Amino acid sequence: CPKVCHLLEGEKTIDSVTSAQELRGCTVINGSLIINIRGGNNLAAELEANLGLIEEISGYLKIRRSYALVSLSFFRKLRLIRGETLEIGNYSFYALDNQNLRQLWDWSKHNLTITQGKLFFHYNPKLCLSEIHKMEEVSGTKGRQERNDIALKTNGDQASCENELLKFSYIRTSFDKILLRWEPYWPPDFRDLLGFMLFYKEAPYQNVTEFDGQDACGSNSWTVVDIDPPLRSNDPKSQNHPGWLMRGLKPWTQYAIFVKTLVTFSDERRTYGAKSDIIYVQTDATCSCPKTDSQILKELEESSFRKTFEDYLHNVVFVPRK
Amino acid sequence: EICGPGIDIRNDYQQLKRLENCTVIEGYLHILLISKAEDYRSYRFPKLTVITEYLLLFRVAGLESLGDLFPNLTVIRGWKLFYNYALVIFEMTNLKDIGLYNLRNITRGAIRIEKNADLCYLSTVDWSLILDAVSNNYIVGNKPPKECGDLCPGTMKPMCEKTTINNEYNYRCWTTNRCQKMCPSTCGKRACTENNECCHPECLGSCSAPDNDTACVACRHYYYAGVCVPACPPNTYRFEGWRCVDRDFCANILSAESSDSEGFVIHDGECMQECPSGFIRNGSQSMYCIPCEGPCPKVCEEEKKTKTIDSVTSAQMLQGCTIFKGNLLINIRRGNNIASELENFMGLIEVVTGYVKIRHSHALVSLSFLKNLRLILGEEQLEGNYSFYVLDNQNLQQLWDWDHRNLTIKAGKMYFAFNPKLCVSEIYRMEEVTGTKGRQSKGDINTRNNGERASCESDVLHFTSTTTSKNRIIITWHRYRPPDYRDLISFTVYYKEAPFKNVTEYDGQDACGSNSWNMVDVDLPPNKDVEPGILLHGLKPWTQYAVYVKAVTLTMVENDHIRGAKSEILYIRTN
Amino acid sequence: ETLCGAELVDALQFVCGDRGFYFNKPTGYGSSSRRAPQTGIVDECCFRSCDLRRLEMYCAP
Ligand SMILES: *[C@@H]1O[C@H](CO)[C@@H](O[C@@H]2O[C@H](CO)[C@@H](O[C@@H]3O[C@H](CO)[C@@H](O)[C@H](O)[C@@H]3O)[C@H](O)[C@H]2NC(C)=O)[C@H](O)[C@H]1NC(C)=O
Ligand SMILES: *[C@@H]1O[C@H](CO)[C@@H](O[C@@H]2O[C@H](CO)[C@@H](O[C@@H]3O[C@H](CO)[C@@H](O)[C@H](O)[C@@H]3O)[C@H](O)[C@H]2NC(C)=O)[C@H](O)[C@H]1NC(C)=O
Ligand SMILES: *[C@@H]1O[C@H](CO)[C@@H](O[C@@H]2O[C@H](CO)[C@@H](O)[C@H](O)[C@H]2NC(C)=O)[C@H](O)[C@H]1NC(C)=O
Ligand SMILES: *[C@@H]1O[C@H](CO)[C@@H](O)[C@H](O)[C@H]1NC(C)=O
Ligand SMILES: *[C@@H]1O[C@H](CO)[C@@H](O)[C@H](O)[C@H]1NC(C)=O
Ligand SMILES: *[C@@H]1O[C@H](CO)[C@@H](O)[C@H](O)[C@H]1NC(C)=O
Ligand SMILES: *[C@@H]1O[C@H](CO)[C@@H](O)[C@H](O)[C@H]1NC(C)=O
Ligand SMILES: *[C@@H]1O[C@H](CO)[C@@H](O)[C@H](O)[C@H]1NC(C)=O
Ligand SMILES: *[C@@H]1O[C@H](CO)[C@@H](O)[C@H](O)[C@H]1NC(C)=O
Ligand SMILES: *[C@@H]1O[C@H](CO)[C@@H](O)[C@H](O)[C@H]1NC(C)=O
């Protein structure tokens, strides 16, 4: 329903869920919003229950140093921005120093609109640029995007942005496990593939997507599984489709799952791996075990150490004759 | 006899017959690319006792244990490594043992072993006794040890000697027939024979009689007529850094392999391929090269436009390279004492034209080893006119001693990123030293990554007062005194329970997990009389919380000159 | 197809066989010639799809 929110000074900074309750129910905003939420628990669900009713903004949006916040999905009903109140330089959307920012709302379901203010993306080292351009497109005003609005650096430059798609060539659902066999993705330097990182989690509603929830650390939402590299052989066609068997899944239950390549960064992370789509599959009706994600980093510098040796060996051993 | 200048066994066993007589290898030794097993034992050479440059084995087949081939090899003086190692055994298909029971010393370089099929008996070695600087080794890509058992004489009464390393005390043994018999403690560093008869001081590896100078198998410094003297006498000249040889011999050798000039040339009591920078063989003589009359910089060309430096041999290629006229890239992943060798190889670099990139140079905590680097011409830059690029480098606590170091870029703007143990203070100091501050942007030199975990100079904010409660604290700290109060001065109070005073500052990495610096932002109150305060509620009637504050200028424009104000970490226990 | 690591050497072996590989003989003491008249070979087989032609250039009859 139409429930405007008349505020003092037209700019309410919200750095705490206690400030979220102040606008619980404030669908239409009389002013702008500023966010500096760096740490806290129950951010996703509380922000959904409080600010989920947000139908539109009259002013602008500023998001500075919002670390613990991973995604913006908590602004579900947000569709339009009047851009009446705007940050210096006509900025409806302003973002800065958002480390754990992984993804924006959606660019296939959620439609957006912008009236007057421009965009801004800097120091978002975990947010890729594809989503940025998708916003530029859907939100409209794509001509308002000027230079320096989105520096390609510090914008998802750290978090690997998968460029290619992967395919499940063969699948089998059981009541307690699930067998998977996907395309043998192999970059030019086959040895650059340290393995695969399957992600999976129960999901009865298909409305789930990536980065729906994450604290300062992301050891809470998804269920990860490492898979050693495949077995390469001569006649590249001869290598069997790499696969894996996921274990321990409730009978007659929908799980959302997707692959994620574990690859190595080149001089400029040129080896952008691949990933498949969020696949929903219903099961059949019938001492700190989790590993440290930090280990991944340790597996990188060592791998690049071996390949830097072989490439050197062959660089001086063999000789081409006249 | 003495072979040389190098041997490369390739595709045939009969080539092994070049090892019958000569016992010294005055150069590298490669053995590789053979496919046969029948004649695995039809060859073996009791004469080999010493190697000088290094040893390399690759894709060799038929061989089961190296020891059966070199029953007398003792020393490897590592005059020249392969990548960073003096001994490499890669992708061997049948090597069941490393042998070399008599191997008693290695001078330079580390070892690298991996991808071997059925090789164990690598941990049983006391590398510390046979190899100094064992940390630079790489011995992980080999067969698991639990599978073979790695036993040795002592299966029935321990026969093999015993030592302790890395908190593990056990036997030291290569083979099931022989052991790694170390020297006694009476002489320690000195050499020794079997039955613990310590050899001459300047001996190395082993010998045939205690205190004997000529019955020695190897020499610590230099050979001469077999007499293991620790110093090359006059009228002679050092060669391959391991043998003091005659003068005329330095002329009979050939150098057309690399440069077909008038053989080698003598300088500093050594027969150098060509004496170092600043010297010429006036009159084209193999015995004298006076100092050049001009600058005489030894230019250093580029096979590939950029000479990626990620090894020690890559630096050896640049030993005398004083003016590297090619683009440069550092990619060192590991290495501990390499920094010292680079002061002998790269320490003479005075100019590096082209871009200079540093990507994942974790092994370098300070670039001071380029003691002579003063001008990066940067005539040829990367994308963005970057004449000095630094990306995803680890700690690098420092670059130089700007108090005395003179560095100046001629063209191109620098770039720095992801240097947690380097706070931008030093980066801005470098800029001031170079006057390039008017050339950089605000996104290139980011303060959000450079210095994440770097705790360095900062202004203080003295806690004006605190009043604790059973579960809360009302704490007021002093207002910041910047040069411009117009700046968006905004404090952030950091806090967390401190049961023990061994607490440190926040470093970004402690976002999630226990003992995380909890942060709360607050703007300076408009009233210029009231000072910033906060009431905190996550407290205990008896807990000792460590808390402080951090203030930043936050100039109008993004990072004009950010000078941070850091307050002491105060421990507070409520009543 | 591009070749790297152990597969490059496996193909080079399949090519040479009993013919053997060709190296640069060290004719004199000191350093050797320019380690290669061009960049490394992987710059032709890893980064580019090197055909049998390039593979035969390093072999020995
Ligand atoms: C194997 O034998 C070598 C014989 O030298 C042992 O020594 C390491 O050799 C280097 C250079 O030959 C020594 O460095 C020299 O030391 C002086 C004085 O300390 C210093 O100014 C230079 O660094 C110079 O290069 C080094 O001292 C020497 N190591 C020791 C412990 O003395 C090597 O230790 C032997 N290997 C084993 C495992 O014992
Ligand atoms: C290590 O022990 C041996 C013991 O055999 C010492 O041998 C002595 O070595 C010198 C020359 O190296 C020999 O001089 C020689 O003189 C004889 C005539 O006496 C001559 O026929 C030989 O051709 C040679 O010119 C000396 O005979 C020899 N003595 C013995 C008993 O073998 C050796 O000196 C010791 N190494 C040292 C001290 O560094
Ligand atoms: C190793 O040394 C032995 C002798 O010291 C060499 O055998 C000599 O080679 C010549 C070749 O012209 C033969 O005529 C002689 O008969 C050989 N000696 C004997 C005792 O038969 C042998 O060739 C040397 N090996 C190498 C690789 O040089
Ligand atoms: C908010 O309401 C006031 C009326 O009290 C109006 O003057 C102002 O323009 C409104 N601002 C926005 C952003 O709607
Ligand atoms: C938008 O740009 C115009 C043109 O200079 C300026 O007058 C106006 O103040 C700007 N608005 C904001 C919010 O920066
Ligand atoms: C999915 O729908 C449920 C039910 O309305 C809602 O609670 C949840 O937040 C939605 N999540 C997503 C990612 O759409
Ligand atoms: C600096 O960059 C500009 C544009 O990126 C380009 O002209 C060139 O790379 C540099 N300018 C010079 C060399 O004058
Ligand atoms: C060189 O360094 C010294 C000491 O830091 C300094 O006094 C001098 O001005 C510097 N000169 C140049 C040209 O950088
Ligand atoms: C202080 O040292 C003790 C061990 O004596 C350790 O248990 C504790 O975690 C340390 N505290 C900090 C803050 O490092
Ligand atoms: C505060 O704590 C100190 C610590 O002993 C105590 O002496 C004092 O009486 C306390 N005062 C109040 C008001 O709690």
Residue numbers in the entry:
A (entry chain B): 308 to 593, 683 to 718
B (entry chain A): 1 to 156, 159 to 577
C (entry chain D): 3 to 63
Paper text:
The insulin receptor (IR) and the type 1 insulin-like growth factor receptor (IGF-1R) are two closely related, homodimeric (αβ)2 receptor tyrosine kinases. Intriguingly, IR and IGF-1R αβ monomers are capable of forming signaling-competent hybrid IR/IGF-1R heterodimers in tissues that express both receptors. Within these hybrids, one αβ monomer derives from IR and the other from IGF-1R (Soos and Siddle, 1989; Moxham et al., 1989; Soos et al., 1990; Bailyes et al., 1997). To endeavor to resolve these issues and to understand the mode of assembly of the hybrid receptor and its mode of ligand engagement, we present here a single-particle cryo-EM structure of IGF-I in complex with an IR-B/IGF-1R hybrid receptor.
The retained 3D class was then further split into “head” and “leg” regions to allow focused refinement of each map volume, achieving an average respective resolution of 3.70 and 3.73 Å for the two regions. Only a single IGF-I moiety was detected within the structure, despite their 4:1 mole ratio in the cryo-EM sample. IGF-I interacts with IGF-1R domains L1 and CR and with IR domain FnIII-1 and the IR αCT segment. Within this structure, the IGF-I C domain appears anchored to the receptor via IGF-I residue Tyr31, the side chain of which engages a pocket formed by the side chains of IGF-1R residues Pro5, Glu26, Phe241, Phe251, and Ile255; similar engagement is seen in the structure of IGF-I in complex with holo-IGF-1R (Li et al., 2019). The interaction between IGF-I and IR domain FnIII-1 is sparse, though potential salt bridges occur between IR domain FnIII-1 residue Arg539 and IGF-I residues Glu3 and Glu9. IR Arg539 is not conserved in IGF-1R, nor are IGF-I Glu3 or Glu9 conserved in human insulin, implying that these putative receptor-to-ligand salt bridges are unique to the IGF-I-to-IR interaction. However, the engagement of the IR αCT segment with IGF-I and with domain L1 of the IGF-1R monomer mimics that of the IGF-1R αCT segment within [IGF-I]-bound homodimeric IGF-1R. In particular, the IR αCT segment engages IGF-I via strictly conserved residues His710 (≡ IGF-1R His697) and Phe714 (≡ IGF-1R Phe701) but engages the IGF-1R domain L1 via less-strictly conserved residues Phe701 (≡ IGF-1R Tyr688), Phe705 (≡ IGF-1R Phe692), Tyr708 (≡ IGF-1R Phe695), Leu709 (≡ IGF-1R Leu696), Val712 (≡ IGF-1R Ser699), and Val713 (≡ IGF-1R Ile700). The IGF-1R αCT segment is located on the surface of the ligand-free IR domain L1 in the canonical ligand-free disposition of the αCT segment (i.e., with its axis directed at about 45° to the direction of the L1 domain β strands; Xu et al., 2018). Overlay of the respective receptor head regions reveals only limited relative domain displacement and rotation.
